[PDB]
Amino acid sequence: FSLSCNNFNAVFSRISTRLQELTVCSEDNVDVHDIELLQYINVDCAKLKRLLKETAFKFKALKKVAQLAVINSLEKAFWNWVENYPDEFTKLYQIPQTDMAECAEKLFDLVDGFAESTKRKAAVWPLQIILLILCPEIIQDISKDVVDENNMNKKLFLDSLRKALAGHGGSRQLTESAAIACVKLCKASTYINWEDNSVIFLLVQSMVVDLKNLLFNPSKPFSRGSQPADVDLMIDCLVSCFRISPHNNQHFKICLAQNSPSTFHYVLVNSLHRIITNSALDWWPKIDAVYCHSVELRNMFGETLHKAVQGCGTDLETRSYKYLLLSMVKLIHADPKLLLCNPRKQGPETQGSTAELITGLVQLVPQSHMPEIAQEAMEALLVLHQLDSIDLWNPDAPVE
């Protein structure tokens, strides 16, 4: 990735050679490892246009296996540009860019023609949204009257997503695919400053409510596959949803509630971990707004600690606490003030809140059953000793 910054052409040339060979050759080959190099090379807006134009010319002539590999590799490139160049992505919606729109529009039709079966549609639909996102005005036309063919295909896909997204379609794959594709659209919207308040915000609002119910229903745990739930998908959605509505989150209480399954708590803590560690954009909301839940966070830790210690002395139930408990320990390590807000203060007949927190950490250091957690507790306890963190123990008397 660092190498591609300067000598982009050298890497790009080898890929361009591979594209021609598959195009001319009619014997399908599976040495797409050259094609999969896009996932790591640094890409810029100007460079990205080069990739779209070249692939579009050869896209129709590529083999089935090659087409999927480029779609996957090309899709990951888009995030690299957005992440590496957040400003450039904003400029796309700040001012119209026909060249950027045209190449995406041209590729969109080529990809749509390739995919006919439902399984094919599922693989390519997530990319289709990115292409649709690239062209803002086509989204506006979709909302309004639809052109006979220009925006007929685009409008059909958008409404098909909602049906699968809402579960009306009797196809599990499309519902799963719709969630991933829709989530990426929501993630991209997070980057939008919202000063423009383009249709992207309005379109997301249409789908945001549906997405939460599908992924954040405690009664029904969304089971993407063998795993009980797609933890990564849920964390990404929650982080985006938090940024959209940080003032008063409605599912934070649902997840933060003790009755909710551990996975919701596990998703909650991990999501908060990203917020504290990964806040690139200043205008995004900050963790400080969440301090109001500090009291509830401590209660969750106490209950987890009691059962975690009890379990060590079911197989998966006990192991679940260890993963969740370790996440909580790391979360405190990132920021100790998060759980120290609203101190209970020592009662005349009962201990305070800071004391109970410290005692729990101390009794885990010599456990020796979970050295990784015990090692973390030492570091966590070593962070609560900083002169800044000494005051947070009890602001009334920090030297007693």
Curated annotation (Swiss-Prot):
Changing residue 251 to L: In a cutaneous neurofibroma from a patient with neurofibromatosis; somatic mutation. The gene is NF1. The chain holds residues 143 to 568 of 2839 of the full protein. It comes from Homo sapiens. It comes from the Eukaryota. Changing residue 44 to V: In NF1; reduced splicing enhancement. The lineage of its organism: Eukaryota, Metazoa, Chordata, Craniata, Vertebrata. This is Neurofibromin truncated. Changing residue 34 to E: Found in mismatch repair deficient cancer cells; also found in a cutaneous neurofibroma from a patient with neurofibromatosis; somatic mutation.
